[PDB]
Amino acid sequence: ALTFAKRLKADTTAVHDSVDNLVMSVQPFVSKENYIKFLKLQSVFHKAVDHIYKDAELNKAIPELEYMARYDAVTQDLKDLGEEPYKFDKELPYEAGNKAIGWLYCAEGSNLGAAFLFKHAQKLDYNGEHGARHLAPHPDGRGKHWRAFVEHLNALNLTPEAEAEAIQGAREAFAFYKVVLRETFGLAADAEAPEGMMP
Numbered sequence: 001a002l003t004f005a006k007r008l009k010a011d012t013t014a015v016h017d018s019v020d021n022l023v024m025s026v027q028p029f030v031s032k033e034n035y036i037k038f039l040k041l042q043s044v045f046h047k048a049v050d051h052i053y054k055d056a057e058l059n060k061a062i063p064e065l066e067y068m069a070r071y072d073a074v075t076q077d078l079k080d081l082g083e084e085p086y087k088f089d090k091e092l093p094y095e096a097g098n099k100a101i102g103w104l105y106c107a108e109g110s111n112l113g114a115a116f117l118f119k120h121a122q123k124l125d126y127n128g129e130h131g132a133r134h135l136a137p138h139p140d141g142r143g144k145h146w147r148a149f150v151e152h153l154n155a156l157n158l159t160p161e162a163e164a165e166a167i168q169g170a171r172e173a174f175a176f177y178k179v180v181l182r183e184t185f186g187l188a189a190d191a192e193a194p195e196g197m198m199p
């Protein structure tokens with residue numbers, strides 16, 4: 001684990017895969033209702049990181065970071081299907097500091113691998129202009145855009161104890177994503193995909 005980015009990854013791949021499994025478990029693209037529940041979920045998570053993509057300091061460290069946010073697009077997708085911007089019951093996490101850097105990674109990385117999701121959403125007749133705006137690949141190409149993003153993440157070079165809090169934040173970002181998922185899909189507390197399942 002050299003770079004800060006490859007360390008965030010190393011430490012969170014496990015929980016990442018459990019999310020991958022949990023998302024696939026609830027059949028997101030099986031029907032329309034389900035894809036709508038999938039959007040509500042994406043909506044809550046992205047709402048929860050919107051203040052972080054828009055944070056003034058981080059926007060100084062990462063040029064145009066604020067224009068990378070995808071909550072805006074998710075609200076547009078919900079509209080697409082005659083839906084009001086979903087509203088979460090409780091009050092959303094509003095993280096800051098080192099931990100917030102972990103949420104950002106979690107969020108920006110999901111745009112990287114969103115390829116798989118985008119591919120299955122298009123079957124359901126959804127894409128960049130209708131229903132799947134937030135899953136569409138970045139105009140500069142997922143890989144390029146992500147490598148560019150990783151550059152600035154690594155450039156932050158915070159104290160090793162800071163990078164630590166960020167990894168702790170990325171882990172909590174993932175856990176939270178699952179809490180939201182469980183509630184949106186009517187799953188019990190701590191519900192996880194069938195054990196042993198692999199992507």
Ligand code: HEM
Pocket residue numbers: 005008009016019020021023024045105106107108109110111112113114116117173174177
């Ligand atoms: C069924 C849904 C999902 C699938 C199939 C999936 C798949 C993938 C794949 C295959 C990659 C590797 C991309 C590459 O290196 O080219 C990736 C990266 C990533 N995904 Fe997911 N993912 C899913 C959901 C999520 C969600 C909902 C989050 C966030 C809450 C998430 C966060 C990330 C992050 C942070 C990365 C970057 C990993 C890195 O450091 O390279 N993923 N995903």
